[PDB]
Design a protein around this ligand. Sequence first.
Ligand code: GOZ
Ligand code: CA
Length: 223
Amino acid sequence: IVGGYTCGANTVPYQVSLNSGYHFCGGSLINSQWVVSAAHCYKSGIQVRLGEDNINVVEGNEQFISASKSIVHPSYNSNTLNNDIMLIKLKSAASLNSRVASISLPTSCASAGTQCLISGWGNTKSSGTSYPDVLKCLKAPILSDSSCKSAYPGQITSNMFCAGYLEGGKDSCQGDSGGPVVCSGKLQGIVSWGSGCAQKNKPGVYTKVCNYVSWIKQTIASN
Ligand SMILES: Nc1cc(CNC(=O)[C@@H]2CCCN2C(=O)[C@H](N)Cc2ccccc2)cc(N)n1
Ligand SMILES: [Ca+2]
């Protein structure tokens, strides 16, 4: 997260870290057994880390649970990042408490201008590299479809939306991939892609979760 702020420990209790020997992506806990992340975060050997603030220190509220299965969306296209969504099933159910909590799926698609919360442990610099240990947060509005398409001509599908600031300075970044965009208490976006971080006229692009609720519900009912 570039240009954001330190969230505060466990104030984003649905935020997860995906660890394969190191943190490599975020995700969102949607019930005690399932995490939503980006398809471009797929890899084998995932451990889901819940209840995290400092990802380099065991502070006492964590739950570490191995994935039993990962399900990348059947229509994910890794060249266009269309349908950039993946479900991860936990080998055992998380214990839900004030520091480990699920986020609801949307029933409608959030509107342009809505202010959302984006979070993660990704790079905090728009030039160069600095990775934080504690969770970072960013408040950002959803941008109009026309602004989004003007920023990335020929690249925005109906399963994507832009959020952020066309002036630059505030964005998600590498390492935030797969993490949540939450608006009105629902998971509306997944950190997906962009061009650089916090660059002028290049806002973040996010998977439009409302388009996937039927697939999510049917998949978790059968796996
Ligand atoms: N820039 C940016 C990045 C992010 C997070 N997602 C990435 O870091 C993805 C992961 C792979 C690289 N990547 C890109 O977004 C690349 N800029 C374009 C690309 C995509 C996929 C494969 C190759 C190249 C959030 C925001 N808001 N902005
Ligand atoms: Ca920790």
